[PDB]
Amino acid sequence: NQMSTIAGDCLLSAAFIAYAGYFDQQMRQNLFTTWSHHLQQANIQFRTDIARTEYLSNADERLRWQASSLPADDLCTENAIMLKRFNRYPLIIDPSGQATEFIMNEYKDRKITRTSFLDDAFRKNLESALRFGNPLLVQDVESYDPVLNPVLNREVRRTGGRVLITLGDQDIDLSPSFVIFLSTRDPTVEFPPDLCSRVTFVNFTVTRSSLQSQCLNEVLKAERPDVDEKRSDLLKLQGEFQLRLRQLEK
C-alpha cells in the first residue's frame, strides 16, 4: 500500500521544500492544501493528512536539532528540514539570532566560520573555506557580493579528472563537502531576482500564524498534556513507531 502511495507524497514534499520557502505558516499551509486538493482532483494517490515534519526527517535529526539550540516551533522544524535538504544554498532570514546559532552549533564538527559581506577579508575566508571543504556562513546579504555568482550557479569546469571552479581571474579547486549559508538580519529586504533564483529562501520571521501556532502548542502542552501526548503519538505513528518496530524485529 505504501508503494502504491509514494509518488504524490514525494511530489508534495518536494514542492514544499523547493517552492514553499519565504512564506509564512498560513501561506505554506494554503499552498500545501491547494496542491493536495489538485492531487485529489487528479486521483493521484498521496497519503492523506501527511505531516512533512517527520516524512523528511525522523526522530534522531529532530532531537539533534533540539540539542543544537533550535526552537520547537513547527515553522522552525520545517525551516530546519529545508536547511538539511537543499539544492540551492539557503538564505536564512531571521529577525532573531536563533537560526544563526542553530546552524552554527549544527556545523561545529565541520568548522563553520563566521564571515560577512562587509568584511574586507570576506573573499579570503571564502577561498579558505572553498579549499578544505569548510562550511562558510555569510551575514548582511543585503550588500550581496557578485563574486558569489559562480559558486551559487554551481558551475563546474571539470577537466583532467578533477573538479574546477573559476573565482574572478583566479581558479580554485572545488573541494567536496562545501556548503555556504547566506544569512540576513532584516526581515524586509528586496533581493534582486538574480540572487533570488540562486538561493532557497528560508524565512524565520514570526508572523500572526506562526505565533498563533506557538501559543496553541504551548497551551496544549501545559493545560492538557494528554492531548499533547496523543498528538505526538499521531505524529510518531507515521515513521517513528514503524522504525522502532523494525529495530525490535531486527
Binding site: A18, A42, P146, P192, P193, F201
Partner: protein, 689 residues
C-alpha cells in the same frame, strides 16, 4: 520660419507659417496644400519647392543599406542648407531629435562633403570632462606663439577643424546644476579662447569649430543645456522622416538591392510601400508608454532592408514567393520578437500578412499562410527556409554533442528554445555589434547564447566582476575583447549581465560601439601603439602590410564590426534599446514547463497501469493523450504547482506586497528535489521489503 520654431514639430512649424501668412504682407507660396516650410527662396527671388532640388540617386547593389551611405531627400537637403548657412558664420549648432531620426549620420555627411573641413567625432559620455577636449586639441592641433598671444590651430593648413560632439547634453550636471564641458565650450565659443593650465596664459582659437547633436532633454539621462550656452547654438529638430521621405529612400534602396535578381525588379515599389506601411502602423501602436523598449526608428527599416539583402545575396533565381517570405520573416524578427504580450504578437502577425496581401494580392497565399517561416543556414549550405522538425532533430544532436562537451546540465528543446536559438544565430551571423537579451532570471538567456556561440564558433568572454571592480578594468577587458576580435580574426561573443554593470561608465561604451563598432577612448599611448602593431601582424596573417597606421586602426574597426558580438542581459535607456536587436526571452510557458517536467522526470518510475482517469485538472491544454496516464498526470500536477506559486505571488502582491520572484530555476529545483526524494524513498522501501 527656420529660426523661430525651427526646433519644433511639423504642426508647430505649420502653425507659425499660418500666423506669419496672416500677419505679413510679403508674397508667399500660393499653393494652399504644401506648408511654407517645404519651400525655399531661389536667387531669382521666387518661392521654389524643395522637391525640385532632390536628385534621384542609384546606390550600388553591394552598398544597399550601408552604415555610411546617404540618400538625399527633402529633410536631408533642407538641413544641409541650414548647416552650410550656420557653418559659414562658424556658429556652433546642435541637431536635436528622437533616436534614429538621422542626425549624427547626416551631420557626418554634410560636414565631410565640404573639402576644406576636417571632422573629428567626439562621443560625449555621462562622465565627459574638458580633459577630453584638451586631449583632442593636443592630438589634432598645435600651440603657436608667433602671433600676439598663444594660438591653438589645427596642424593641417587651411583646414577648419569641426569638433563634432554628439550627445552634447549627456554629460552629468554637478551638485550645483552645471556641466563642466558645456561651460568650457561656452567660454571657448563666446570669448574665442581659453586659459591653458600649463602656464596660465590666454590661448586663442583659430580654425576650430564646434558642432553638436543630441536626443531630446526629456529622454532619460539627458540634462537640459544651460541658457548661457544655448544662446550661441541654434538647434534644429530633426524629426523622424516622413512617409514620403521613407518611401523615396527605401524605394531607392530596394531598387538597388533587387537588381541582383532581375526577376523581381518590378516588385521593388510595392515592397517599399508595404515596408513603410507596416513601419508606420507598428510605430502608431507600441508607444514608449506601454514598454520602455517600444521605440521605432528608420534604423528598424534599415535593418529590414539589410536582412533581406543579406538573404538574397547568395541566392539566385528567386521567385516572388521567396521574396515575400523573406520580407515577412524579417518583419517577424524585427517587429515581433521584441514584444511581450501574445495579443501584441498575433496583432503583428495579422498585420504583416494583411499588408502582404494588400500590396501583393495576386500572389498565392502559401508563403504568408505558412506558419513556421523560420530559416537556417545550418541545414544545407545557405540561408533557406527549413521545416521545424528537421531543424529540431539537428539542433538536438548538436546540443547532445554540446552538453557532452561542457555545460553538463541537460537541456530540453521546447519550441521557444528553438526560436530563440534561431534568433540568436541570426544576430551572430550578421556583422553586427550587439545582441541584448531581456527575460526573467534563470530562464536560459545566457545558456542559449553560449550554445549558439558554440555552434557558430564564437569564443566566450565573461567579466567576473567582484565587489572591488573598477571602470579601468572594464575598459581594459573591452579593449582585450576588441584586440581578440580586431587584431585577430577570431570572432568573440562577449557575455555580460546587469550584475556586471554598476555605473553608467560601463554603459554608453556599448552604445558607441553598437552604432560605430569602435571605442576611440580606449586606445591611447603605448596601448594604441600595441594595437597598431598587433593589427599589422594580423594584416600579415590576412596578407596585408603595415600600410597606414590610421588605416591599421580602420582595419581594426572593420574587423570588430564584422567579428565581435557582445551579448548582454537584464531582467525586465532609449538609445541602447535601439542600437540592439532586443529579443524578449519571456518566462517559460505551460508547454515549456510540461516538456521540462516530462524529460527531467523520465528516469523516474511512475507507470501505474491501474490509474483511474479523473476529470478536470486541466493545466497543459495540449495533454499528450486525451485520457491522461499517471506520468502525464504527475507532470501536469508539477506544472500546476508552478502556476500556483505564480498565482500566490500575484495575490500576495495584490494584497499588500512583499513577494519574491518565481523563476524557471525554481522549477528545475522542484523537479530535482522530486526525483531525488522519490528515488530515496523508493530505495529505502525496497530495501525494507
Amino acid at each position: 520660419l527656420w529660426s523661430l520654431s525651427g526646433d519644433s514639430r511639423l504642426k508647430m512649424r505649420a502653425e507659425l507659417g499660418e500666423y506669419i501668412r496672416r500677419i505679413t504682407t510679403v508674397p508667399l507660396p500660393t499653393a494652399p496644400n504644401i506648408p511654407i516650410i517645404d519651400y525655399e527662396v531661389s536667387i531669382s527671388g521666387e518661392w521654389s519647392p524643395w522637391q525640385a532640388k532632390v536628385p534621384q540617386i542609384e546606390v550600388e547593389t553591394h552598398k544597399v543599406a550601408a552604415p555610411d551611405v546617404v540618400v538625399p531627400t527633402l529633410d536631408t537637403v533642407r538641413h544641409e542648407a541650414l548647416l552650410y548657412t550656420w557653418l559659414a558664420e562658424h556658429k556652433p549648432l546642435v541637431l536635436c531629435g528622437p533616436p534614429g531620426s538621422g542626425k549624427t549620420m547626416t551631420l557626418f555627411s554634410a560636414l565631410r562633403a565640404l573639402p576644406d573641413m576636417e571632422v573629428v567625432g567626439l562621443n560625449f559620455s555621462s562622465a565627459t570632462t574638458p580633459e577630453l577636449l584638451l586631449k583632442t586639441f593636443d592630438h589634432y592641433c598645435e600651440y603657436r606663439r608667433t602671433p600676439n598671444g598663444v594660438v591653438l590651430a589645427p596642424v593641417q593648413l587651411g583646414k577648419w577643424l569641426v569638433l563634432f560632439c554628439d550627445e552634447i547634453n549627456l554629460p552629468d550636471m554637478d551638485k550645483y546644476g552645471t556641466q563642466r564641458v558645456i561651460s568650457f565650450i561656452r567660454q571657448m565659443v563666446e570669448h574665442g579662447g581659453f586659459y591653458r593650465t600649463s602656464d596660465q596664459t590666454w590661448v586663442k582659437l583659430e580654425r576650430i569649430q564646434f558642432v553638436g547633436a543630441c536626443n531630446p532633454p526629456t529622454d532619460p539621462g539627458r540634462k537640459p543645456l544651460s541658457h548661457r550656452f544655448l544662446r550661441h547654438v541654434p538647434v534644429v529638430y530633426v524629426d523622424y522622416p516622413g512617409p514620403a521621405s521613407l518611401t523615396q529612400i527605401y524605394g531607392t534602396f530596394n531598387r538597388a538591392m533587387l537588381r541582383l535578381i532581375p526577376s523581381l525588379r518590378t516588385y521593388a515599389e510595392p515592397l517599399t510601400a508595404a515596408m513603410v506601411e507596416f513601419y508606420t502602423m507598428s510605430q502608431e501602436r507600441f508607444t514608449q508608454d506601454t514598454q520602455p523598449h517600444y521605440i521605432y526608428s528608420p534604423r528598424e527599416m534599415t535593418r529590414w532592408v539589410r536582412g533581406i539583402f543579406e538573404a538574397l545575396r547568395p541566392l539566385e533565381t528567386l521567385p516572388v514567393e521567396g521574396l515575400i517570405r523573406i520580407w515577412a520573416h524579417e518583419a517577424l524578427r524585427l517587429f515581433q520578437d521584441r514584444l511581450v504580450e501574445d495579443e501584441e504578437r498575433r496583432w503583428t502577425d495579422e498585420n504583416i500578412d494583411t499588408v502582404a496581401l494588400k500590396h501583393f494580392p495576386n500572389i498565392d497565399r502559401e508563403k504568408a499562410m505558412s506558419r513556421p517561416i523560420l530559416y537556417s543556414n545550418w541545414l544545407s549550405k545557405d540561408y533557406i527556409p527549413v521545416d521545424q522538425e528537421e531543424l529540431r532533430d539537428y539542433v538536438k544532436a548538436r546540443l547532445k554533442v554540446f552538453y557532452e562537451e561542457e555545460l553538463d546540465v541537460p537541456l530540453v528543446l521546447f519550441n521557444e528554445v528553438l526560436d530563440h536559438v534561431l534568433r540568436i544565430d541570426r544576430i551572430f551571423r550578421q556583422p553586427q555589434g550587439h545582441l541584448l537579451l531581456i527575460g526573467v532570471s534563470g530562464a536560459g538567456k545566457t545558456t542559449l547564447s553560449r550554445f549558439v556561440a558554440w555552434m557558430n564558433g564564437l569564443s566566450v568572454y565573461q567579466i567576473k566582476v567582484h565587489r572591488k571592480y573598477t571602470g579601468e578594468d572594464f575598459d581594459e577587458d573591452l579593449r582585450t575583447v576588441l584586440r581578440r576580435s580586431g587584431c585577430k580574426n577570431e570572432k568573440i561573443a562577449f557575455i555580460m549581465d546587469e550584475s556586471n554593470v554598476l555605473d553608467s561608465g560601463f554603459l554608453e561604451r556599448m552604445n558607441t560601439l553598437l552604432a560605430n563598432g569602435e571605442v576611440p577612448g580606449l586606445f591611447e599611448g603605448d596601448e594604441y601603439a600595441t594595437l597598431m602593431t598587433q593589427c599589422k601582424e594580423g594584416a600579415q596573417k590576412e596578407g596585408l602590410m603595415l600600410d597606414s597606421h590610421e588605416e591599421l586602426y580602420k582595419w581594426f574597426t572593420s574587423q570588430v564590426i564584422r567579428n565581435l558580438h557582445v551579448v548582454f542581459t537584464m531582467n525586465p535607456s532609449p538609445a541602447l534599446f535601439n542600437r540592439c536587436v532586443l529579443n524578449w526571452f519571456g518566462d517559460w510557458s505551460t508547454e515549456a514547463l510540461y516538456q521540462v517536467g516530462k524529460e527531467f522526470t523520465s528516469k523516474m518510475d511512475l507507470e501505474k497501469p491501474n490509474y483511474i482517469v479523473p476529470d478536470y485538472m486541466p493545466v497543459v491544454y495540449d495533454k499528450l493523450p486525451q485520457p491522461p496516464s499517471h506520468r502525464e498526470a504527475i507532470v501536469n500536477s508539477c506544472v500546476f504547482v508552478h502556476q500556483t506559486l505564480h498565482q500566490a505571488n500575484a495575490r500576495l502582491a495584490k494584497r499588500g506586497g512583499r513577494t519574491m520572484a518565481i523563476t524557471p530555476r525554481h522549477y528545475l529545483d522542484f523537479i530535482n528535489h522530486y526525483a531525488n526524494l522519490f528515488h530515496e524513498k523508493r530505495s529505502e522501501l525496497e530495501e525494507q521489503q
